[PDB]
Every structure is written in structure tokens, then in C-alpha cells.
Design a binder for these strands. Structure first.
Lengths: 669, 669
RNA sequence: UGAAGGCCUGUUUCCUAGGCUACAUACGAGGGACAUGUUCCUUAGCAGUGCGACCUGGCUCGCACCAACCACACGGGGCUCAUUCUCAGC
């Protein structure tokens, strides 16, 4: 049966052979996609006279009658995607006068000859793609007043002349796609005849660096602002290539996937207003300083995988002062490249750059010296992503130049050293230091003395050592909020740790073998860890070997919202272990060994809990153990996932596997 | 209090100040070792007149009265070790006439001047060591008729002359130790004056390539049979060194720890009757063929660590035909050496050898070719130990020469290959192949086709792969009894495996992740492993991930004696799982998750059990689960280790951590 | 006096055989989101597209198991010092 919902009956994957006419008569939307339909009888739309749009696609619909839309004058969107409409006639639409969006995706309409769209005056979107068209002309008169998207994708247009374009005289083509159409020639004036042409999409149209030169002149004196040229054969460019754009104001230009091998001297000198430029996925050999000459307004450059693979000692290389022209650049991306290493004047000139990414860019950057980032002295950087570079060591003061740096990322590297606090010399105001997934990070007493402004500090899977030294290396980080120490196998710690971080909110301790610290039989008592940092919200102690939470290591943590103590080994919980957690919102105690869940322990937190999770525990179906629990279950509104399936008793001998919430407690208490 | 036992009152570590005289008067032995005693009052031994021997050592005993032994005429062994008897006089023993063993180990009896031993006529053992003696003479008359062990260890004898020896004229000295005594000269006739001198022990006496040549002549025409020269400075030997032994019948000669650097040509040419020779712990450079010339009767040679460490390209080396003279040798040991590898004619000549060891002997033996053991063609080998040689691959037919080989050992190696059955070509009648602790052993269908005579086959920790192929690679091993497959992480196996091994007795499967095979929810049912091989005695399935033993995978195994299912995850046991185990003798189910031990399951095996072990399980202290168990406990004679401590409960909420045995089942059943 | 010893008492060192711990890593199963290579299945008897699906893969990513890994806590086996209780020879 179809899913009737608030006047939008969506009938998807219903195998409907013929259009059903069911109850709802106020429906405004109807989905027919993914159904085998012969065709649409124009008369079954009398019980359905209110539909504003109808999604009728992915059905083998032979043909269409003008009745369907003219018996339904209130029509806005008619989706007719992938249906088989081999031919079309103006009659079909002579009545249709309210539609604004006409979708035709795969219909074998190959040839049209009529003036079918003299009636659509409100038609904005007009998708005519993959239909085997051999010419673009769709009429003889000046029609389609307000048409803002004209797609012609994967058709067989071979050329563009002003004769097959004239029917758009006063329209404003906000997006004219022509992707994958094997164009070979653009008749002069085949673009001057469109009213207002903003965008363009020549993807996959197999262009040559010569055709381009011509197309440019045919785009001159036009109002084009976006222009894409992805998936072409622009093996190289010269100053004469884009010469035709000089009379234009081109905002964004894309050149990804062109196997572009050479970027001639002064090839961009004629785009003094370009504000975005994507060079992704090209095999660029090198960049002379005069390469980018002209782009005095560029604001976003992407070089992701834009350089040839490393050869043969023919690795790609950029020369000094190569960016001295982009005095306005503010986002430079250079991922996935093989550039050897940085030079003293590589980034010289960028006096406005603020987001720089170099993830997986260098190959010989094993060691970061104090002279690597000298180029970025005058650049107000606010971000530096250095993931996946095989960095193996950071020399002293290497970041002294990045004064205003805020978000720094050195994760997924091979750093194996002993932090001595000097590595951060100069990071006046640093926000967060994502430093996870490294080889070895021996800590010292002053490792973080120089950066007292940290907010987030990730140390996931860095094989930490020397974390019990006193005082805590985290002592000077007073503004710290988010701290992560998972997957480190932290043998032991002193309670001195975390002293004074009154702002710590999120704390992670997954996989850290913290068993002994909380056992009652310690050298000198269980570690009253988590002391007086009231502001903690989310606490994580998953899979920590934990065996016993000693009474009152959760004191004064009133604002704590989410405890996650699952995957440990907990059987006996001493009363009042949770007493200040009166605002707890989500508890997780799965895969533990908890046999009994009494009221003196979980009472206070279960009060206003929101989502509990204690699946897979060996629950004990007796009345002096789970009675109160089963009752709470019956009378709660706390989302408890898989209550019927994964909650089950494993004792008594004759209750092994019995549904937890079925144990009748009505005969006790 | 002293431990009185069957007339042997042993008072060890009792802090006894003065000799107590308690009830037992039939005691024949009395231990006094490790007690601080001033001395032994000869009059407190009137209540104790029956002792035959008294172990009175490790006590600071000033002196001894002749009364103690003469009031006890029936005395056989008087041990007086480590006591402080600065002086002694004949009077002490003029009465003593029944003692047979007198022990004096560390007493500062530096000088003696008397005939103190004219009375001991039955004294066999006479230990006089570490006593600061400056001469060996212990009397002037021909005494000590039957004396068969005269120790003088760690004293300060400087020479041996026939004057200080004459008091043994007609005695037969079966062992004359002179260890650690810094001897400098052996006056002529210092050995011809003893009646029958068989053994000798000159350990640690700091000899030289000189002194030896002379001592030999002083030992000539004597009846010596054993001779030790360990811990000396024989830096090299020549044919003239042992020349003095030619007139003797020398059975065993030891030369260990002599830093022996060169063994000159014909150094042993004068010992045509030596039958044991230990060259252990020496720095021998090389062995010419003429090295062992003469030893035509040797029957046991030891070269354990007898070759210099590997240099500097100056590694030790053995030449061809170096053993051509030892045509009677029958046990050659060559452990802990650095010889590069075997040559075509290394072992040529040994036509009687039957035990050969080469553990940790070679350095460049990564690959064993079919021409390595060509030397052993005519040697009836019955053992070949090759552990710890870093062997990495076995070529085809490498053992074709060792026809009569029975016990072969290739363990603790780096073998990483795929057995194709050819590696055993020629092992007509092989007994066992210890092949554990290797890198990788891919198995094939014919791996053991050529050796159908195996008895024991160890494959411990070899990371086996391809063990589920059909037919079983163990199919032709019909006489197989002991099979080991532990620590291999065997993912899965087909039931075809072990088909026809009706003689298999011991089977090991520790640590092999065999969980799913026995689960009821298999592709086509649980694998009826261990099918119809009734003769299995000891079955081991420890730590195997096991989760459920399906009913009747233990059918017809009547003679199975010991099941070991510890370190698994077993909670429910379906009735009748053990039914044919009516002769089971020892069960092991520790560290499981067994909550209930009922009667229908463990009944039949618990009948005649001998030793049970089910510690660390989460037992359920309720009456419909453990009642019968607690009862059985009260009414059994089955050795149950740690019954009081490691058999506790986990349910109900009370009775938690409660000792099992103290659970009163008198109010139910 | 010094020197020498049994005797204990504690330490420390060092190993070896443990159990227990957690971590990375790996071999497996069984999962959920794919676009695929073909298989059905109908649509314009065929070709082309367009109701879902199955089999095979390249998997990403959570899960249970087991193995070896190294880390952590604690026993357990040798040795080497302590300062006492008592000798003699002087």
C-alpha cells in the first residue's frame, strides 16, 4: 500500500501497474518513481484534481496527453525522468500554462520540430538531457521569458550557431549546461544572442587547447560569471588561450581533470577579476614565478592532486616567489602531492592567506626545522593541516613565525620525540592542537607551558609515556575544555593530574588499563581522580579494565551529562556511588558483568535519565535483584534500545535466555 | 618442636641452643643441621644410646669428646660439617671403632700431628676438605685398610711425596680428590705407594701444559681409570703431554674448562683405551684429521661449547676426515658452537655413531640441501637434534641418507615452507618428528605420505595453514599415537580430519579458535570431530573459544581419561553430554562461565573421578542448581584443589562471594 | 683488637617459570551503506533504456572469537649486602 502522508502520497517501489486512485483528494504531491507503468490515462485524474506537482519518473511511459496537465491547471512541477517519450508535439503543451519546472531525462526525443514552448511563460527549470538531441534549437520565436536553467547533457550537439539559439532573446540563462556534448565549432555570435548568460558547464566536452582560444572570443562581451572546463584535453595553456575573457568579469573558473601538463608564462594575465580557481587533478610539472601573473584578486586556489607523481628524479617542484602575485589569496589547498619540501621563499607574498592545507603533500619532510615556515612570516595564518606527511621530528621553535595561528593539526604522522615545550615557541594564541595518531610522545613537566590558551587537545593513540610526573604537564592549560587520551594504555597516573582545569568539559579515557587506580586495595587508597572539575559534561571510561568504582569518586560532578563505563568488568556496585549525578542524561553500562541493578545505586541517576544502555549483562532474574528494575522499565520514558532482544537473564537455571521485561514481579514486594 | 618420625628425629632450623633429650629412645638417626650449638655434652647421650648416625653439622661446635662416640658404640655415620674444630687428637678416636663415614668439611684443623686413625678399621668415607691443610699425611702406620673415598678439597697442599702418602699401603682408594689445591710438584713415587688408586679429581688446581707432562709419568703403571683435569690452564697439548699415561688403562678423561686453544697432531696417540672424553667449554681453533689419532676405542665425545666464538673472519673450522679414527664412537655432542656449516666429508668414518646432537652449532645453515648429511651415509643414526640453528628451508630428499633414523628434531627454527612430502624421502622407519616452534608450515595433501611409521608428531606453535584440505594430511599416519596442534590459531577444519587414526592417544588443541565448529548453528551442523577413535586417552581443548559442546561429540570414547576444557566460555551444558566417560579420571573446567553444575550432565563422569578442578566459575548458590554438587562434595574422595578459596558464588544478591562448601542444602531436596 | 664463620633478620640486584592485566597488530566468521562484472525481470520478436532482486568482487566501517605482540600490576626462583645472637686463635 502507498504511504499516504499529509497530502504527499509517495508511492515508491510499489510495482504499481496502473495508476491507483485512492482516498486522499487534498493531495498536492504524488510520487510514481520506480514502478512499471504503461502510461498515464488522462482521465484517472478526476478524483485527483488538486495535485500541484507529480513525480512520475523511472516508468516506461509511452506518451503523454495534454489533458493530464490541462485538467490539472494548478501544476508547478512535472518530473518525467527516464520515461520513453520518443516524440513530442506542441499540442501536448498548448494547454499547459502553469508549469514552472519540466524534467525530461532519458526519453529518446532525439529530434524535435515545432514551437512546443510558446505557452510556458512561467517555466524556469527545463531539463532536456541525454535525449539524443542533434541541435539545440527548441523553437523559432522569442519565448521562455524567465528560464534560468537549460540543461542539455549527453546529447549529440556538434556545433553552436546563433540560428539555433535565437529563441532566447530576452531570457536570463542563469545556468546553461552543455556537458559531454562533443562540440567541434562555435559559430561567431553563438553566445551574443542570449539575453543574460551567467553560468556554463562544458564538462567532458573533449576540448582542445585550440578550440578553447576560439570559444573564449565567442564568450567575450558576455555576462558570464561561472565557467567550468572539467574533463577536457587541455594539455597546456598559453597567454593566448583565455585571451577572449579579457572583456569579461569572470568570477569562478574551473580546470580540474584536464591532464594539464604545462601552465605557460602569463597564462592567466587576462583574468584580473577571477575569485575562485580549481586546478585539481592535473599533472602540472612546475610553476615559474610568472605562472600566476595577473590574478590580483584571487581568493580561493585549490591544488589538490594538481602535481605530477614523483618520477627518475623528475619530481614536481615550485619555484620561489611563485605566489607573490596572489596578494589577496585566502584559502590555499595543496593536498595529495609529491613536492619534495618547502623552501625559504615558497609562500612569500601571500599577505592575506589564512587557511592553508598541506595534507599528504611532502615526501622529504621527515624533520621540521625552524626555517621551514619562514615564508609564512607575514601571512596571518589561522589554520595549518599537516596530516599524513610522515613528519618524524619537530625541531625547536619551528612555529615561531605563525603568530596568529589558531587551529593546528599534526595528526596521522610519525612524530617520535620527547616534547620539551619549545616546539610551541611563538604560538601566542593557539586554539586547539590536534595531535593524535603518532608513533611516540614522551611528555615532560613543561611540555605545554608555552601555550596557555589551548581549548582542545587531542592525544589519541600516541603511546603516551611519563604522564604521572608531577606536576601534571596539563597544569598551565587553564582554559582547556576538550581533552582526549584514548588508546594509550596508560598504566598509572597521580591524582595531581587534572588539578585546576576547572573548565574541562569533555574527557575521554577509552582503552587505558586504568584498573588498579580505583581498586580499594591500593598502596595508599583509590585515586580520587576527577577532583573538583565540576564543569565536566561528557565522561568516557569505556573499555578500561575497570573492576570497582570506589565510593565517591563522582562527588561534586553535578553538571555531568553522560557517563560511558561500558566494555569494562563491573559486578558489585557499592551504594550511593551515583549521588550527585542528579542531572545525568545518558548512561552506558553495556557488556559489563553486572548481575543486579538495585535502587540504592541507580536510583538518583535513573530519575531523569534520557537514554540507558545495559545490554549484554548477565542479569539475575530474582526478585531481590531486578524487581525494582523491571518495574522502572514498565513505568519509564527513557529510550532503551533493544530492550526485548539483548536484555536477558542468565540465572536462575530456568530463566536462561528469558526476555528481561517479562519477569513478573507482581507476586513479590 | 622437633619433627619425630619413625626413629629419625629431624631437628632442622629449630634455634636449638643445647641438645634436647625428648621421649623417643629407639631413634636411630638424628639431624642437627642449621642450629646454633655451643657444643655437644657427651653425657646427654645416655637417654639416647641407640642412634646409629647423627647429622651434627652447620653448628659452631668448639670441640668433641671421645665419650660421645664411645658411649654410642653402634655409630656408622658422624657428619661434622662446617663446625669449628681447630684441633683434633688421636684420643678423640682411640675408642671409636664402628664408624664407617666421617665427614669434616670446614673446621680449621689446619695442622695434624698424631696417629689419629689407628682405630678406624671400617671407615670408608673420609671427607677432609677446606681445612687449611698444608700436608696430606694423616698418620705414620699402614692404616685405613678399607678406605674408598679420601677428599682433600680447597686445602693448601703444595706438593705430593711418598712420605706423606705411605699410610695407605694396602688400601684401595676408589676416589682420591685433590681439587683446588695449588699443587706445584709431584715428587717421584707419590702415586706408586697407594695400593689401588682408581679415580682422581684435580679440578681447579691451576696446572699448565707443563706440570701435566710430569704428573703423567708420576701416574704411570698405576691402576687409575677416571681422571679429571677441569678448570686448569692447558692452553695447548702435544703428543708428549699425556705421554705418561701410555702404561695405563684409562677409561674416562675430562678436559673441560681448560681454555684449550690447540690440539697438536697426535696429542691422544697414547690412549688406545679411552672410552669417554669431555672437551666442553674450550676455545679450540681447528681440528686437523690427525688430531684424534689413537682413540680407536672412544665411545662418548662431547664438544659442547668446545670451539672459539665466531670472529674478524676467524671462525672455527673442522677439516674433512677429522673423525676417521673414531670408528667406535657412539655419542657425539656438538652444541653451542659457531662452525659455519657441514662439509661433504665432515662426519666421514663414524661407522658406529648412533646419537648425534647439533643444537645451536651452525651459523650459515639457513638452507639444508640434499648434500649436507652425505657424510652420515654409513652411520646408523638413531637421533638427530637440530634445534636453534636458524634453518629456514629444507630442500628435497635432504634426509635420504639417514635410513635408520628414529628420533628427529627440527624445533626452534625458522622453517618457512610448504611441505610436499619429499622432505622426508628416505626416512624408512622414523619414530617421532619434533617440529614445533617454527615460522610457517603450509600443509599439503601428501606432506606425510612417505613416512607412514610415525608415532609422535608435534606441530606446536608453527602457525599451521591448509589443515582443512581433503583428504586429511594425517591420513597415512596409521601408527600415530601422540599428536600436538596447540597454539596455531586453526580457524576451521573438516570432519574428515583424523579419520582412521585408531591408535591416537594424546591430542592437544590449546589456543586454536575452534568455537563455531561445535556451535549448533553451523552451515550443516556441528562437526562431529574426534570420530570413532576410541583409543584416545588424554584430550586437551584448553582456551579454544568454545561456547557449546553439542550432544554426542564424545560418543564411544570410553577410554578417555582426562578432559581439559578450561579457559573457555561454557554456560549451558545440554543433558547427556558426558555419557560414555565412565572411566574418566580427571576433569578440568576452570575459568569457564559455568553457573549450574547439575546431575544429568556431570553424573556419569563424577562417579569414579580422581581429581576435579572447576575454580573461578560464577557459581549460582541456589538449590535447584548446586544442591547435588555441594552434596557430592561432602560425600566424595575426589582430589579437589583449593575447594575453600577459589569456589565462590555470584548469585543470589546475598551469598555473593560466599565459600561454596558452607552452603547448607539441608532445607531442600 | 682485627681477621673467620654457622645463624637468622630485612633490603636490594638479577633472572626464570607463572597467573592477571590492557594495547597496538593479525587470521577468521557474521553484519549494515555502496556503484559496479553477469544473472533473472518486464517494459520500445529484437535492440536500447528505464519496478526492485540475487551471485560474485574491490571494500570502508562498527561486532564476536582466537593468536602471537609489547606494556602495565603482583606473586614466584637465584645471587649480592646489612647487625644482630655466639665461636675459636691470640
Amino acid at each position: 500500500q502507498c504511504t499516504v502522508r499529509y497530502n504527499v502520497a509517495d508511492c515508491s517501489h510499489l510495482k504499481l501497474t496502473h495508476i491507483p486512485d485512492d482516498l486522499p483528494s487534498n493531495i498536492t504531491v504524488l510520487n510514481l518513481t520506480h514502478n512499471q507503468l504503461r502510461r498515464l490515462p488522462p482521465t484517472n485524474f478526476t478524483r485527483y484534481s488538486q495535485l500541484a506537482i507529480l513525480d512520475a519518473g523511472f516508468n516506461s511511459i509511452s506518451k503523454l496527453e495534454p489533458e493530464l496537465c490541462q485538467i490539472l491547471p494548478l501544476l508547478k512541477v512535472l518530473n518525467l525522468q527516464h520515461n520513453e517519450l520518443s516524440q513530442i508535439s506542441d499540442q501536448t503543451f498548448v494547454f499547459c500554462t502553469n508549469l514552472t519546472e519540466l524534467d525530461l531525462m532519458s526519453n529518446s526525443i532525439h529530434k524535435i520540430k515545432s514551437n512546443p514552448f510558446k505557452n510556458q511563460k512561467n517555466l524556469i527549470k527545463l531539463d532536456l538531457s541525454h535525449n539524443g538531441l542533434s541541435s539545440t534549437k527548441l523553437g523559432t520565436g522569442v519565448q521562455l521569458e524567465n528560464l534560468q536553467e537549460l540543461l542539455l547533457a549527453k546529447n549529440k550537439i556538434l556545433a553552436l550557431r546563433s540560428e539555433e539559439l535565437e529563441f532566447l532573446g530576452n531570457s536570463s540563462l542563469r545556468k546553461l549546461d552543455l556537458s559531454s556534448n562533443p562540440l567541434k565549432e562555435f559559430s561567431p555570435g553563438c553566445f551574443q544572442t542570449i539575453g543574460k548568460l551567467f553560468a556554463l558547464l562544458l564538462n567532458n566536452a573533449q576540448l582542445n587547447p585550440h578550440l578553447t582560444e576560439k570559444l573564449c572570443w565567442e564568450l567575450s562581451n558576455t555576462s558570464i560569471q561561472n565557467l567550468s572546463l572539467a574533463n577536457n584535453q587541455l594539455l597546456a595553456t598559453s597567454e593566448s588561450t583565455f585571451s577572449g575573457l579579457k572583456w569579461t568579469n569572470l568570477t569562478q573558473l574551473d580546470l580540474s581533470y584536464n591532464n594539464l601538463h604545462d601552465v605557460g608564462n602569463g597564462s592567466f594575465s587576462y583574468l584580473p577579476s577571477l575569485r575562485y580557481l580549481s586546478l585539481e587533478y592535473n599533472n602540472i610539472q612546475r610553476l615559474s614565478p610568472r605562472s600566476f601573473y595577473g590574478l590580483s584578486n584571487l581568493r580561493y586556489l585549490s591544488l589538490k592532486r594538481a602535481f605530477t607523481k614523483q618520477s627518475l628524479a623528475s619530481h614536481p617542484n615550485i619555484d620561489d616567489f611563485s605566489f607573490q602575485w596572489l596578494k589577496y589569496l585566502e584559502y590555499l589547498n595543496m593536498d595529495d602531492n609529491n613536492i619534495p619540501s618547502t623552501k625559504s621563499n615558497t609562500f612569500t607574498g601571500l599577505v592575506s592567506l589564512k587557511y592553508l592545507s598541506l595534507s599528504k603533500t611532502f615526501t622529504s619532510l621527515q624533520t621540521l626545522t625552524n626555517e621551514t615556515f619562514v615564508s609564512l612570516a607575514h601571512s596571518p595564518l589561522l589554520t595549518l593541516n599537516l596530516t599524513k606527511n610522515h613528519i618524524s621530528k619537530i625541531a625547536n621553535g619551528t612555529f615561531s613565525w605563525l603568530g596568529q595561528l589558531r587551529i593546528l593539526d599534526l595528526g596521522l604522522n610519525e612524530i617520535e620525540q620527547k616534547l620539551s615545550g619549545q616546539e610551541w615557541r611563538g604560538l601566542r594564541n593557539i586554539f586547539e592542537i590536534y595531535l593524535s595518531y603518532n608513533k611516540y610522545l614522551q611528555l615532560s613537566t613543561s611540555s605545554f607551558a608555552l601555550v596557555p590558551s589551548l581549548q582542545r587537545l587531542m592525544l589519541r593513540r600516541v603511546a603516551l609515556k611519563n604522564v604521572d610526573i608531577s606536576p601534571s604537564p596539563f597544569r598551565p592549560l587553564r582554559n582547556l575544555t576538550i581533552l582526549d587520551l584514548s588508546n594509550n594504555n596508560i598504566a598509572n597516573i597521580n591524582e595531581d593530574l587534572l588539578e585546576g582545569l576547572e573548565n574541562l568539559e569533555i574527557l575521554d579515557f577509552q582503552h587505558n588499563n586504568l584498573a588498579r587506580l580505583w581498586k580499594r586495595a591500593n598502596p595508599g587508597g583509590p585515586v580520587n581522580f576527577l577532583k573538583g572539575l565540576s564543569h565536566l559534561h561528557i565522561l568516557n571510561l569505556e573499555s578500561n579494565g575497570l573492576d570497582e568504582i570506589p565510593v565517591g569518586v563522582f562527588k561534586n560532578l553535578f553538571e555531568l551529562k553522560s557517563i560511558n563505563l561500558g566494555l569494562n568488568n563491573l559486578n558489585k556496585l557499592e551504594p550511593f556511588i551515583f549521588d550527585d549525578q542528579t542531572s545525568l542524561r545518558s548512561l552506558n553500562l553495556q557488556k559489563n558483568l553486572i548481575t543486579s541493578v538495585e535502587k540504592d545505586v541507580f536510583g538518583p541517576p535513573f530519575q531523569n535519565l534520557n537514554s540507558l544502555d545495559m545490554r549484554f549483562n548477565p542479569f539475575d532474574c530474582t526478585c531481590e535483584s531486578i524487581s525494582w528494575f523491571v518495574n522502572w522499565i514498565n513505568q519509564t520514558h527513557t529510550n532503551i534500545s533493544e530492550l526485548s532482544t539483548h536484555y536477558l537473564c542468565n540465572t536462575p537455571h530456568h530463566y536462561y535466555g528469558f526476555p528481561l521485561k517479562l519477569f513478573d514481579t507482581s507476586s513479590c514486594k
